[PDB]
Amino acid sequence: SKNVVIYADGVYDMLHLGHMKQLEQAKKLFENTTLIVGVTSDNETKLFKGQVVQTLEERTETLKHIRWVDEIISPCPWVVTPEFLEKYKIDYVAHDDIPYANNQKEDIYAWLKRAGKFKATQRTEGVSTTDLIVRILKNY
Amino acid sequence: SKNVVIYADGVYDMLHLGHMKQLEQAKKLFENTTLIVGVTSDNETKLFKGQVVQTLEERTETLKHIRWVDEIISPCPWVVTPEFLEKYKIDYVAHDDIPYANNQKEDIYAWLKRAGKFKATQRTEGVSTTDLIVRILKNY
Numbered sequence: 001s002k003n004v005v006i007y008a009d010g011v012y013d014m015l016h017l018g019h020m021k022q023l024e025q026a027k028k029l030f031e032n033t034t035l036i037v038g039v040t041s042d043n044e045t046k047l048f049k050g051q052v053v054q055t056l057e058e059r060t061e062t063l064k065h066i067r068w069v070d071e072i073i074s075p076c077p078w079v080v081t082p083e084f085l086e087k088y089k090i091d092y093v094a095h096d097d098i099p100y101a102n103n104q105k106e107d108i109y110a111w112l113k114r115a116g117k118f119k120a121t122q123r124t125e126g127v128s129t130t131d132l133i134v135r136i137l138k139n140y
Numbered sequence: 141s142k143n144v145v146i147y148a149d150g151v152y153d154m155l156h157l158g159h160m161k162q163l164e165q166a167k168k169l170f171e172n173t174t175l176i177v178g179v180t181s182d183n184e185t186k187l188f189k190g191q192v193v194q195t196l197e198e199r200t201e202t203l204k205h206i207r208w209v210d211e212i213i214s215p216c217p218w219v220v221t222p223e224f225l226e227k228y229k230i231d232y233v234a235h236d237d238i239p240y241a242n243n244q245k246e247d248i249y250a251w252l253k254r255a256g257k258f259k260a261t262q263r264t265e266g267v268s269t270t271d272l273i274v275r276i277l278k279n280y
């Protein structure tokens with residue numbers, strides 16, 4: 001079976017079980033794959049989404065320890081472009097199907113879905129690190 | 141080159157970059173290895189070391205997402221025994237060389253070092269999750 005290149009981009013801040021299960025999902029979209037993972041720059045993340053906890057260096061080094069990750073682009077661009085897919089020869093982009101707004105686009109993954117190049121992944125809730133301190137705030 | 145079986149046991153609570161680098165170290169002790177990772181039971185950990193944050197189920201599922209881990213024993217025994225090595229055909233046990241007391245033994249890894257069956261790993265400090273909330277406690 002031919003090898004399919006999947007691109008999962010994210011902030012991947014303070015990596016937790018939900019991200020791990022997503023990367024596993026992406027990696028496992030086709031029998032034979034290369035999972036490329038893009039990590040967002042500290043500047044852009046703080047500019048578009050909000051406060052990041054770990055630096056690009058820290059978020060990128062952890063991804064290096066995860067079984068499903070084949071290559072990392074660090075830092076990665078914010079909006080996937082068609083020129084970006086040809087450059088890294090990506091066949092599919094993987095992320096959750098919840099639309100992801102920009103400021104000029106409502107979805108940012110829209111064109112990938114219309115082109116067939118979007119493989120939706122699912123989220124794991126309640127397993128975040130912030131959620132675990134909330135759990136620790138049950139011994140006091 | 142023959143395959144060497146390495147056994148790294150730990151609590152592995154709230155897995156962080158130090159544990160990842162240790163497991164990478166153990167896995168990479170010999171060109172060809174099987175890394176077995178033992179995870180300590182919730183009861184025993186709370187009984188010998190102290191309060192654990194995540195449950196055995198939670199600590200074990202994360203280890204499943206780490207590139208260097210080949211097999212998991214969950215739960216694992218507290219003190220490595222000679223019968224335990226023959227059972228899982230472990231050639232070497234990996235952990236930091238800091239002696240690890242019991243209540244009746246001063247080191248617990250002592251006999252493995254005297255027998256040559258101990259491969260020391262190094263720690264990574266300052267990268268723990270508790271350390272990262274301390275870092276977050278710099279925006280208020």
Ligand SMILES: C[N+](C)(C)CCOP(=O)([O-])OP(=O)(O)OC[C@H]1O[C@@H](n2ccc(N)nc2=O)[C@H](O)[C@@H]1O
Pocket residue numbers: 009010011012013018019021022040049077078079094095096100108121122123124125126
């Ligand atoms: C536009 N980008 C790509 C530059 C940034 C978008 O990336 P993000 O904002 O989705 O960042 P993120 O790190 O929260 O998500 C990374 C990946 O983990 C998945 N994720 C996140 C949290 C969670 N509980 N479960 C998951 O499966 C998200 O669906 C996403 O596919």
Ligand SMILES: C[N+](C)(C)CCOP(=O)([O-])OP(=O)(O)OC[C@H]1O[C@@H](n2ccc(N)nc2=O)[C@H](O)[C@@H]1O
Pocket residue numbers: 149150151152153158159161162180189217218219234235236240248261262263264265266
């Ligand atoms: C006697 N046991 C084996 C049952 C429990 C001993 O295991 P532990 O108490 O060392 O638990 P732990 O989870 O803190 O350590 C797991 C592994 O990660 C390594 N570790 C831990 C913290 C850190 N900053 N750097 C590391 O390299 C430790 O040396 C150990 O080799």
